[PDB]
Design an enzyme around this catalytic site. Structure first.
Site, PDB file in Angstrom:
ATOM      1  N   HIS A  17     -11.182  65.552 -16.321  1.00  0.00           N
ATOM      2  CA  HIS A  17     -12.569  65.109 -16.565  1.00  0.00           C
ATOM      3  C   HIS A  17     -13.282  64.623 -15.329  1.00  0.00           C
ATOM      4  O   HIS A  17     -14.476  64.339 -15.405  1.00  0.00           O
ATOM      5  CB  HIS A  17     -12.606  64.070 -17.693  1.00  0.00           C
ATOM      6  CG  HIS A  17     -12.093  62.713 -17.317  1.00  0.00           C
ATOM      7  ND1 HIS A  17     -10.792  62.287 -17.555  1.00  0.00           N
ATOM      8  CD2 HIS A  17     -12.707  61.671 -16.702  1.00  0.00           C
ATOM      9  CE1 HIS A  17     -10.669  61.039 -17.126  1.00  0.00           C
ATOM     10  NE2 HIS A  17     -11.809  60.636 -16.621  1.00  0.00           N
TER      11      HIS A  17
ATOM     12  N   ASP B  26      -5.155  66.403 -19.384  1.00  0.00           N
ATOM     13  CA  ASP B  26      -6.165  65.852 -18.509  1.00  0.00           C
ATOM     14  C   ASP B  26      -5.643  65.716 -17.098  1.00  0.00           C
ATOM     15  O   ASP B  26      -5.360  64.625 -16.614  1.00  0.00           O
ATOM     16  CB  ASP B  26      -6.678  64.529 -19.070  1.00  0.00           C
ATOM     17  CG  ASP B  26      -7.927  64.023 -18.351  1.00  0.00           C
ATOM     18  OD1 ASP B  26      -8.564  64.784 -17.590  1.00  0.00           O
ATOM     19  OD2 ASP B  26      -8.286  62.843 -18.596  1.00  0.00           O
TER      20      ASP B  26
ATOM     21  N   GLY C 142     -14.381  54.288 -13.102  1.00  0.00           N
ATOM     22  CA  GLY C 142     -14.226  54.501 -11.680  1.00  0.00           C
ATOM     23  C   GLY C 142     -12.794  54.596 -11.226  1.00  0.00           C
ATOM     24  O   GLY C 142     -12.540  54.999 -10.069  1.00  0.00           O
TER      25      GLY C 142
ATOM     26  N   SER D 141     -10.533  56.512 -13.047  1.00  0.00           N
ATOM     27  CA  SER D 141     -10.040  57.813 -13.501  1.00  0.00           C
ATOM     28  C   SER D 141      -9.548  58.686 -12.402  1.00  0.00           C
ATOM     29  O   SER D 141     -10.153  58.780 -11.328  1.00  0.00           O
ATOM     30  CB  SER D 141     -11.148  58.592 -14.247  1.00  0.00           C
ATOM     31  OG  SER D 141     -11.174  58.271 -15.617  1.00  0.00           O
ATOM     32  N   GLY D 142      -8.463  59.401 -12.692  1.00  0.00           N
ATOM     33  CA  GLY D 142      -7.926  60.350 -11.736  1.00  0.00           C
ATOM     34  C   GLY D 142      -6.891  59.757 -10.810  1.00  0.00           C
ATOM     35  O   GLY D 142      -6.143  60.471 -10.160  1.00  0.00           O
TER      36      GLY D 142
END
Ligand SMILES: [Ca+2]
Lengths: 57, 223
Positions: free
Chosen positions: B40, B84, B175, B177-178
């Site tokens: 995402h 994801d 912020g 995420s990932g």
């Protein structure tokens, strides 16, 4: 129900992506933080797209 | 990161920031040419920023390298959030040094209760919004699949795990995420989603990297 009148939806994902929403109380397209998934429709990638779709709602 | 602490400059040398004119996601460096992040977090025009501490200042150890490929898992489902994960190839190889270093992929999955390190430049408030200048860190345990499914009925797939504290107060947030969840020196998770930030009974959900190791190695090698 006009999707342009819905409050902006960050959603459950944890990104910090700046999107636009139409703020009917202010009469303008405004920025908000989108989390990256499960967007609702009052969520635009530019001010121009927001104004085109929702301006004047 | 809510409820965490200042990591210290370059103490998490595999942490990268994904920049599209501003910081919008984290990622983890897995070799000099490749970063793992969340599906995402896909955007065109990503710039990867390595060696960062203060992301609002140019401090002296940064490398800014554009993505040349941003490859979302082919079975990512943008409604269920299953799979994801995304691989980003750097247009040139990063220069590896003490402040820019790769993190190992797992050889096996981690168990409930394993303590991990979660990091990022996401919001630090559970109510309201404050984005840090410097990188933040949080130590948190992996939770059981049963507790995860109890927290989020109908939502947890075999490729997700929960981590955190059920009492609230400590979590990843917008912020982050990932970015990495690292346990015993292995990248076991990717910051994915939650319900609010740091709320009671609502732990964070993370992509279960151990399920993707073969895919990650083969995709990197094929690109
Ligand atoms: Ca900097």
């Amino acid at each position: 129900p006009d999707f342009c009148l819905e409050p902006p939806y960050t959603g459950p994902c944890x990104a910090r992506i700046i999107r636009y929403f139409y703020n009917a109380k202010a009469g303008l397209c405004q920025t908000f933080v989108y989390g990256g998934c499960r967007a609702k429709r009052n969520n635009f990638k530019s001010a121009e797209d927001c104004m085109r779709t929702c301006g004047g709602a | 990161i809510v409820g965490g602490y200042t990591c210290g400059a370059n103490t998490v040398p595999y942490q990268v920031s994904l920049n599209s004119g501003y910081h919008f996601c984290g990622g983890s460096l897995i070799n000099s040419q490749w970063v793992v992040s969340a599906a995402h977090c896909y955007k065109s025009g990503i710039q990867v920023r390595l060696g960062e501490d203060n992301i609002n200042v140019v401090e002296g150890n940064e490398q800014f390298i554009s993505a040349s490929k941003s490859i979302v898992h082919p079975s990512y489902n943008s409604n269920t959030l299953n799979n994801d994960i995304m691989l980003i190839k750097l247009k040139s190889a990063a220069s590896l040094n003490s402040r820019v270093a790769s993190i190992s992929l797992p050889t096996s999955c981690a168990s409930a209760g394993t303590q991990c390190l979660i990091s990022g430049w996401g919001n630090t408030k559970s109510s309201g919004t404050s984005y840090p200048d410097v990188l933040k860190c949080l130590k948190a345990p992996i939770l059981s699949d049963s507790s995860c499914k109890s927290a989020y009925p109908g939502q947890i797939t075999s490729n997700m795990f929960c981590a955190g504290y059920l009492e609230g107060g400590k979590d990843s947030c917008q912020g982050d995420s990932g970015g990495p969840v690292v346990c015993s020196g292995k990248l076991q998770g990717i910051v994915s989603w939650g319900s609010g930030c740091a709320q009671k009974n609502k732990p964070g959900v993370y992509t279960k990297v151990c399920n993707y190791v073969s895919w990650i190695k083969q995709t990197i090698a094929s690109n």
